[PDB]
């Protein structure tokens, strides 16, 4: 099917490089480290998303005046005025930021929140990109063993 579609468009011939893995068993020793666990990975993606959703709803309920990713000033955007938008912002920026979510948001200098947002950001860091990527990395390291 892919080889035939390669004539209608000359880019489906890139899918034929998967034959070096699914046809020749020269990469099984390596790929058997990711495909051995299986279910565990889907449970991990099904748990990380729940924890990120909890952090998102907490931010929506207590951190309105922070999600202000304005450019050039007085252009409010990428705010928390929508649950789905805030959830997407979290899942797209806070996970891949490498330093939690506190490095992509405003400085938590506001009163009555100076400590609550510190707990929020540092707990997000310690619970999302520290002990939920460690689970994936241990699911990949244990499979080799």
């Amino acid at each position: 099917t892919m080889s035939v579609l390669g004539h209608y468009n000359n880019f489906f011939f890139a899918a034929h490089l998967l034959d070096i893995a699914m046809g020749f068993k020269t990469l099984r020793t390596i790929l058997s480290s990711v495909t051995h666990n299986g279910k565990q990975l889907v449970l991990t993606v099904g748990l990380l998303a729940v924890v990120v959703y909890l952090y998102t709803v907490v931010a929506f309920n207590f951190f309105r005046k922070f999600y202000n990713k304005s450019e050039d000033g007085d252009t409010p955007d990428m705010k928390c005025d929508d649950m789905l938008t805030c959830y997407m912002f979290h899942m797209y920026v806070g996970v891949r930021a490498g330093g939690g979510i506190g490095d992509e948001i405003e400085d938590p200098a506001g009163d009555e929140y100076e400590i609550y947002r510190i707990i929020f950001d540092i707990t997000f860091f310690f619970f999302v990109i520290v002990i939920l990527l460690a689970i994936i990395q241990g699911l990949i390291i244990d499979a080799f063993g």
Binding site: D111, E112, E114, I115, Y116
Partner: peptide, 20 residues
């Protein structure tokens, strides 16, 4: 007003240990 009073309120409970 929570950036400074938290540590003071946390240590104000250990006065019962300082007295003993």
């Amino acid at each position: 007003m929570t950036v400074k009073d938290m540590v003071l309120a946390f240590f104000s409970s250990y006065w019962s240990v300082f007295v003993t």
